Amino acid sequence: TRTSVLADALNAINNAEKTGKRQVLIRPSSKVIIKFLQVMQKHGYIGEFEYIDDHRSGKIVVQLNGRLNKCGVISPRFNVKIADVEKWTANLLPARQFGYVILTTSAGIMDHEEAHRKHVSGKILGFVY
Amino acid sequence: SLPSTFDLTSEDAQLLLAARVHLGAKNVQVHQEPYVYKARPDGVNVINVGKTWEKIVLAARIIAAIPNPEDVVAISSRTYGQRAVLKYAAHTGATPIAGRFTPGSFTNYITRSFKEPRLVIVTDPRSDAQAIKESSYVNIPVIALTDLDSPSEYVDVAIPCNNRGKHSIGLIWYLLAREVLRLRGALPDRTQPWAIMPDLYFYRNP
Amino acid sequence: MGKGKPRGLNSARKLRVHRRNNRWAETTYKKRLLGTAFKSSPFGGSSHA
Amino acid sequence: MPKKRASNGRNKKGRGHVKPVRCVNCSRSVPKDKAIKRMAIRNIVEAAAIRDLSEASVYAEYALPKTYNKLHYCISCAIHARIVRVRSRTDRRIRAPPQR
Amino acid sequence: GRVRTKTVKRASKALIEKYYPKLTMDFQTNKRLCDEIATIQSKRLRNKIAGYTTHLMKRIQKGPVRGISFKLQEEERERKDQYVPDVSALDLSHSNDVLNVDTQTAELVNSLGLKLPLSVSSV
Amino acid sequence: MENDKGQLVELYVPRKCSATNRIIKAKDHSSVQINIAQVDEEGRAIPGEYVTYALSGYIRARGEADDSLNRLAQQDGLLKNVWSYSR
Amino acid sequence: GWVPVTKLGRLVKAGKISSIEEIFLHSLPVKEFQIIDQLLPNLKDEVMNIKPVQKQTRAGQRTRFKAVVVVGDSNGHVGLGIKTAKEVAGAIRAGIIIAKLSVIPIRRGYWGTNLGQPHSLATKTSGKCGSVSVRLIPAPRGSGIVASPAVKKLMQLAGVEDVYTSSTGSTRTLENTLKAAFVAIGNTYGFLTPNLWEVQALTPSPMDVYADYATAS
RNA sequence: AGGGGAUCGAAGAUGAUCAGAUACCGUCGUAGUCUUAACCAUAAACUAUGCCGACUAGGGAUCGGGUGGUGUUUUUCUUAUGACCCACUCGGCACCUUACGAGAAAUCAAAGUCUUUGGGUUCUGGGGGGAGUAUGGUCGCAAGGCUGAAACUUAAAGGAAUUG
Ligand SMILES: [Zn+2]
């Protein structure tokens, strides 16, 4: 059974970008996927995407750019205590220059640079770069 | 963009349909592959005409771009195309290869038949599989006169053609040899059929 | 591929107990816990005698 | 000995362990899939004549029937001359029969 | 078992390729033209070149051969392929009536061009 | 690809594939350069001017070099009514 | 003596391609030995090891000597070459030739802000060969090379100052260890970054411009 | 423990071969083979590949439905079913061709989406022997299952491929 809807979305994107595609169809759909994709949309990893509304659940279609490399997920949403973000950002990303570890918290759904300014942290969802 | 002139000659539509260029492509279907216009009854397809004549002019524009003429290679192992390639080599500078390719031609500098070209033109991807696959080792583009049966391994700019036999090989090289000379060459005007002849290509009696 | 082992947020118990079983398949761990050095090994589990 | 063939004894697929059948020569038990089934039709009179019987006989036309004997051979027995003959590595793959 | 060797056929190809003139049928005249140009040490090997070169002249009057066909032989085709026996008429115009195309091919003309000659068949 | 204030550090600022937007490596022997001529009024061709493309060896081996060329050509204006958006 | 074959060989002898970039940018082959000697002056040319290898014969065996050699300088170029001749010292001559033909660039960076010149890898790269995976992994200033002595010589020729490693597998096989690391160091140019997203004009190659001077007239 | 008991048949008799043959070959041959009530719970119980879920590549066959075709026939006249053909579609047993991926390699469209490592979850393993033995439980009328050690010995045992 599809226990993680968020994992199915980012899995389908990786197989498309590997083959050399410019469009992906994610079926299950959610609020959290739309919040996750809009962070990628700001930093230039993904172009435009449009939500098809079946009178039922949802269906998303994305436009790939040719910039992505990997878009991963970490399923057991571990708790993070601001100072311990240095462990996760070092391992999951390459280099200290750029990359994003997309996490969730009581403010909203931030990247690790955005969350550092506010002095705020919580659970983790996934990453890019 | 384009000269707003080469809009497919209405007289040349008679030459294509008489030679059976757009009356086949077999039942079998590789799935690239949008060069079609519906299926005829009893296991026969129909190739679109406007798509072919556009791509032949596109192929001529790539051949015209190279500065040194004696460079673009024409290849044919199939016995029908052997006569057509020899004519193309005579009109404009283009070293031909008839029959066997001899493996290690583009690679391996010891060989007597050592080419080092910047463009390859092929008749059949099926029979000339050695020519297309081995050309990838030293960064060479390809042009293929394919039909809907043959594969697309390293095949750039594939002109849709009819590889059943006889006529359409002779006609497509005749139109290529014309369009190469139209853009930088002998002919100062596109009008007047030009002669020469299509039947100077073709298969002969043994 | 879930890699066999339980990757749950509340898996704690099974993760700890599975390894106390698998720890017994190592000679240095097995001989330290059971203590054959005292009961065997002619010396009294010592350097010199 | 690693993996030799993919299909092996062949047709037991989407199916449990099947009925066996006895060989002709050895009287040895072997599966019906892994059987080597030749079908040998023979003229009931031997072709070395064949005229000599029909010359002296009664009636015109004459039926002159044929026996329809289906045979089975337990692999090792078939390597003695029967439908096998050991093959090369890539020659194994040809499922198309020789001749016809 | 008189199979001629490779070193005989090395000379037999090299001599006939360049010097197609000075080669006419018989042994004795062509034998005098082997020692003419080349510098062979022995008599046996010298005369054995004359044997196989003269044998190729018997076949050359009954068509060509693969690998041994140069200078005159490429030109001795050649008009036959260049100025072909055909063409009387065009040919392949609309000599036999005016295009016997199919139903689907007739419909294909309407989208692209406008009007060609059509004797449309029902298939 | 940058440093403090003065100049750009690095060499070989590499070519990206026109179809996929993927970096073409130095030893990737298979990559190609399609140079297409610039036509003028009533035949002709402008000498020393091209509409250049570049394809990676990855997609060329796959089989979608021909389909990718007609997509690029129709947008630049080197073709008419060949490659369809909807299919 | 010199005397070139092929179009690029004649082009370098005239003296138009400087050193080097125009070969690597446009992905041109380099089959001639004499090109890299003309372009790059500084080359080492250091031998790693020599294995006698046996093939079985009906009455004896055939001793043949493999020769692993590394090539580079101290800026950002490295190479590798293996060859198996029956002469021992002659195989080193053959090994140095082949390694020059497969010389390949490297992309360096930071490592924690710019300030001055770069002296380590930009991104975390890796390469596999057989069953030996290598992983690197930049460092800060003043850490030095942290790898096996065999791998250390390959990194010294590259001009990389500071880098960590994490080899995993049967790493004693010195051919597969270096050849796996050669993919990891060669895969630096390939991984996209925020810097390389900006679009460039597609330039004409040396072969297109200088067509008439090359080729035998 | 009952019934049945034709054929083949461990034990066993009994002819040859053999230096010996109580082994293969042959002639017979008890139990067993079949069933009715109980038991036993193991096999190369092998696709030597744990289940549920996505996504990635083409190609025709086939077994079951379900669609449409003035299609072909059946012919009792249109029939109307059926049975054949052409295209399409869900589910299933399988195959072919390529690897861009994976792998130590044989090979694999899953053994792919893993140093760019994280979809959910059960089970088993940690050099070779001693050993599936000792001992103690527990289960069976028995045969034996399930559970399951160490002292002590040793530098190799092994997998896939290449030459001879
Ligand atoms: Zn048998």
Numbering used by the authors:
A (entry chain W): 2 to 130
B (entry chain A): 2 to 207
C (entry chain X): 1 to 49
D (entry chain a): 1 to 100
E (entry chain R): 2 to 124
F (entry chain V): 1 to 87
G (entry chain C): 39 to 255
What does the paper say about this structure?
The GTPase eIF5B is responsible for the correct functioning of the second checkpoint. The G-domain and domain II of eIF5B are functionally associated and are responsible for the bulk of the binding to the ribosome and the GTP/GDP regulation.
A final addition of eIF5B and 60S preincubated with the nonhydrolyzable GTP analog (GDPCP) effectively stalls the factor on the ribosome. The reconstruction exhibits a slightly rotated configuration of the 40S (∼3°) and contains a tRNA in hybrid p/PE configuration, where the Anti-codon Stem Loop (ASL) of the tRNA is deeply inserted in the P site of the small subunit, and it is base-paired with the AUG codon. The L1-stalk is displaced inward, stabilizing the tRNA in this hybrid configuration. Kluyveromyces lactis subunits and eIF5B in a slightly acidic (pH 6) buffer background were used in this work. In this orientation, a stretch of residues flanking tyrosine 837 seems to exert a relevant role in establishing interactions between the G-domain and domain III.
